[PDB]
Write a protein that binds this ligand. Structure first.
Ligand SMILES: [Cl-]
Ligand SMILES: [Cl-]
Ligand SMILES: [Cl-]
Ligand SMILES: [Cl-]
Lengths: 408, 408, 408, 408
């Protein structure tokens, strides 16, 4: 069986995949996205230019790569077309599953009204997927048919629209948008299951880019604050129509400390000066809001958990430099839970307290390209993570520069 | 003195300028925007394609036109660059005032945090204009200088940023965005006052597109629900550096009934079935929210007021067909205010009640291209508006089709 | 019967249509090209930008216009795609006849080899049209089928390829180009006869742009130096599938003097200083070679001939200023042919000698916008042309500026 | 001293660099072009799309790469802008030497007239370089100044223009083109010597792409049929302002047989069926003319010569499969010259006759990825080339597929 490698962020997201996935792409013929909406992915700076890949697989920055958006992705044609515009010609380089669900204008309108009543459109688009009332990319090949079906849907749903105080979308406008999507996307729409199976049959090199944090997995992450989809490696197989025998090497991507964007259990969070420092140095700041992210110490219990959920062959450790010059650093080696010490991630994480090992910091790992040259305390910290995680660290990034990486 | 014609919406906006301004552009060498941010303008459908002109003057759809964004406009480079992308080449067709104020990323972030604490960035950008702490388009010609100045500004303001819980913007990111704006916008940035004066000196044909509803004028509109800027015709002169002797023909654009998007005094609002019908037939629905706009009967007191504020030579009456098949239609000829009948717009409009004339409806004006062929009741309604407004109606639009228009 | 207006150059080309057609377009819903390859049309400068319309109708500079490339045109997909790239979005604005003949790469290769043996590809593409072995635009909707058919054609023709010493085109390359043409052109390809008939049925305004000089007409022009196609007005009807009852107003475009680009009979040619002056002032210089065109005095015999061939309602007289400051100007009022004076264009034009009237020049018509203000000698010259041509002059252009035009 | 690697074609061109350079680029930070005009480079197919890099370095297909067009290149702004259009955004990825010579419209016109009198514009642009009358890229930063200087040049040269029968270029047109070049190219124009020196100082990875066949070198190639510039490795250093100490690894690219496009000495040419077969299988066919290239057996004397001229560390052997199924293959191991056997390339190559070794062919090397799996006769042929060339073969390409390559 010819196999696909897999790469996933094993935290709450922002593990810094981009530097990693981007370097790796050169070695693959196919780069594939599996699940999630456009809440996934990342932005990446290349030679001073900002690239958004929320929908598109990272391989689109490597013209040799063929990039597949799989059955599992929830695709907004608007967001996709806007991302495509960052490139001159993607034909032959980008294929979109005819089975991927559409997140259309009306999903955004529904989403907005719902927030009032208390990545737009993703939730309602997923809902329509699960209720099997939504429509899929292949239907864009028949805009007039799709438009008529949608109009029928809205009618049948009119009380839902009234309850949200939004009018039934215009048929004229809808047809015009659908025709536009048809004209633009037709050359990219294909059966991606057939194509990906063919690639593996021909022994081509295939990378699956898991697009979201393992701790955000709908089943295994810290529920309710999680995404709507499976984020772990077997989920990546599923969204692409691949089977467990087709899983190759699997690399987890992990920061040397932890962050969360929103609310939800965060055992190792540091609300004092250490955390604040991490936030500044690590630049963990929402691009859209300018808000500082929540920051905390490396959580080895959470990481061991997601390592096992993903079946990691290797860890790629990021932003180690962000800890330069800390006198002491913490690792959470276990939890205090309901009066006991536990080694695992319980379903109610809000009830655990971190149990820390303290370790001696270092002056600088920043920029270092050679393992031996690392501050001895940094070597100890790395070895301690590896040990607690249960997975070898094969990659260390000592700075934002693509060039500064240590290989083990 | 060689003169510039002017066109303004004389209601609360959405008067339907686009059909009007677009037809007129063919006859002008220069089309100019004066004030406001990107909350102004409109979108227009051409041969099935949706065009956003919020920032850009409508003349950009007529390659013969030179389009000026004046000193008075508050320009977001991001929004402007995105609008420009709808066109292949605007060089020589589009010029941006080096004196126009910049609405940058940080204004959006400020704007968002401010909403929490209770067209992004427009308010804070205007505030920086009035406090004379903001920066202007010409400064983009020196990105490094502008970047340094902005960094200094943020530092001096750091407590304001702390109070909003948003971090000081990255210097690296800022320089990169400013350099990008510089590289892209350099060919369009010029002294627009010198250029427009030259055009009039050479007896070129000039149209000023007022971009916002007269009833939304900051001074004369229904305060607090108004925009931040002057919307009436003399304001249009001011934003472009033009003097009262340079005002030509001035056309007001008015719907055959009235709408408001948000809250605020609306004397002629109809919250019953008539209003609902108007909303549906007139398609008065927020493009972004799908929410029905507030609708009401033509207000002749408000229209006489804005006609005089603008110094209208002529009215262009829009969406007359939206009243097809009403048995009876209303016109508000006066108000009941503090126990009296009044003929004017008082500063506190929330205290007036409409005094209506009722008039007999008609079956169809829809599609009619000849004045004589109009239902006699429609002729009476038109004559009655003209009389109450104090301005001749020179244009009647009987449907969305560019072709269906009556000239008087 | 609802009708299409027509505009044609009535000389040997370069009559200066662009200023004329461009001004007129604003008044039409449809602008149509009829016959010829990409040897037709012109380039036009707008606000300092150079636009090539060889294939595309001039109406593409007026987003309100719908532009039709008719059955009669010989379309090179490469040249067409390159012209389209001057615009951001033409969808809904540009339609290409599914019956138009394709001028493909191999026609260019054939064309080149044929020149050796003694607008590339046009001749061989026309030949394939007349022999009914060529393929048409609609076939691009099935690239694989078209590719297979072409391969079969080449095989059957292999001795022709051997005789030209060019190899049989690659099937792989051909499929790739055809697929590309398919992906790009699909949204523009339609039945243009049905569409144009519908437009006239709906009483839409239609302009047919004749793309080549009447004296270059294959039947009526100076043979052998002529184009391969009919250039006169009834030919314009034919290429679009229109009937004689559908012909509206017909405007001929004529320069105040005459030019020819290549060899061939040119009765009024002036090979001395007068001609040289005309060439310089009129800027009659090949854009691609920098070669001076042949120039000569107005030929009233040729113009009366093409006026009658076209059925002109009106003349539009161009570049009158180019004669400013001539002490004397000539008009050829008749010919000396085989010992007689003749009033007509004989089939062998190389055998005629011009018979001139001499007339008094003027100082300047340049820039003049008012008929009355014209130098009296210029009025006399204009009246004399009109008289000899048999058609009223309704348009006079006194300079390159769009604004400088006199209407009669 | 930090060093730049170099890659050159060591034949008459078409050695098949693209597959090679493209694979290598992923490993470099900078990819640089040194000399030549747009007669150099190649086209490359990526995932079914045709890319022209005549001017641009091959690294532009790898967004991580920074691409430098060096002092030595003769740059046509038109050709460069057209090549750039194949990409959406090159800012930060492409820099053009402010010292590179300009090949402008008038050079093309001169070039055309000169052919009459018996990659347009290249020759006359080079001539202007050598006579020190030409202008360079940096001058585009002052279009008005450059335009004035050029006008002065043309005047001083007017008899040259008269002798060529082409008019003095329009000042208006020239300014408009120069302004356009200025607006478009400003963000890419820099001092490339300073930039490249900085890169090496910072120990960045640098590849120099030699753009033309070593046997076409102006000094060392088969004169008069050669290009105008130095094509060998030290020439590549010179065009970029690099010194001999900065030369790294140098890879020669060589086909398993030989081709020439035009006339000129070609010792190993085969004008019979063997050569014809090579031409068909190797697809050696002019893309623009469809003409079969001249083909011949591998010339070991020529290859040893260019290996030494370039200082090759390694050979990369291409199109070995094109010889599949030949019963016998030839290698030219020496020449008969003026009655003697010689081992070197004499200045008059038209006077040598090939002295062949004959060797046993093989069935298929096509597609083979493993050295050991090669037909034993193929191993012998490879070993024999290496031996005669004096350079190890480190790369073997067994087919067009990027994937089919053997590494030694
Ligand atoms: Cl691209
Ligand atoms: Cl455009
Ligand atoms: Cl456009
Ligand atoms: Cl790109």
């Amino acid at each position: 069986m010819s196999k696909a490698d897999i790469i996933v962020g094993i935290q709450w997201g922002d593990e810094g995949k981009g530097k990693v996935v981007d370097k790796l792409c050169e070695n693959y013929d196919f780069v594939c996205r599996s699940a999630g909406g456009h809440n996934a992915g990342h932005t990446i700076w290349v030679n001073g230019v900002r690239y958004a890949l929320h929908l598109m697989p990272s391989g689109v920055l490597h013209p040799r790569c063929i990039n597949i958006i799989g059955n599992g992705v929830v695709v907004s044609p608007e967001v996709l077309i806007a991302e495509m515009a960052q490139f001159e010609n993607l034909k032959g380089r980008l294929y979109i599953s005819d089975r991927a669900h559409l997140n259309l204008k009306h999903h955004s309108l529904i989403d907005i009204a719902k927030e009032k009543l208390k990545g737009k459109g993703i939730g309602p688009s997923y809902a329509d997927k699960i209720n099997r009332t939504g429509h899929r990319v292949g239907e864009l090949l028949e805009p007039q048919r799709l438009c008529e079906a949608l109009i029928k849907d809205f009618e049948a749903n009119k009380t839902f629209f009234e309850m949200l105080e939004i009018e039934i979308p215009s048929a004229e406008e809808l047809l015009a948008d659908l025709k536009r999507f048809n004209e633009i996307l037709t050359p990219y729409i294909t059966d991606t299951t057939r194509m990906l199976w063919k690639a593996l049959d021909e022994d081509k090199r295939v990378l699956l880019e898991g697009a979201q944090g393992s701790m955000l997995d709908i089943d295994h992450g810290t529920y309710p604050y999680v995404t709507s989809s499976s984020t772990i490696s077997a989920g990546t197989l599923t969204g692409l129509g691949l089977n467990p025998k087709e899983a190759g090497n699997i690399i987890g991507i992990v920061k040397a400390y932890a962050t969360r964007v929103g609310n939800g259990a965060f055992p190792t969070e540091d609300k004092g000066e250490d955390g604040e420092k991490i936030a500044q140095i690590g630049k963990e700041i929402g691009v859209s809001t300018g808000r500082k992210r929540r920051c905390g110490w490396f959580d080895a219990v959470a990481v061991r958990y997601t390592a096992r959920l993903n079946g990691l062959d290797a860890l790629s450790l990021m932003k180690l430099d962000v800890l330069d010059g800390f006198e002491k650093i913490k690792i959470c080696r276990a939890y205090e839970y309901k009066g006991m010490e536990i080694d695992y991630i319980p379903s109610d994480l809000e009830n655990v307290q971190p149990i820390y090992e303290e370790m001696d910091g270092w002056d600088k790992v920043f920029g270092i390209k050679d393992y031996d040259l690392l501050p001895e305390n940094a070597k100890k910290y790395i070895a301690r993570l590896e040990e607690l995680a249960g997975v070898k660290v094969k990659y260390i990034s000592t700075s934002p520069e693509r060039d500064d990486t240590i290989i083990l």
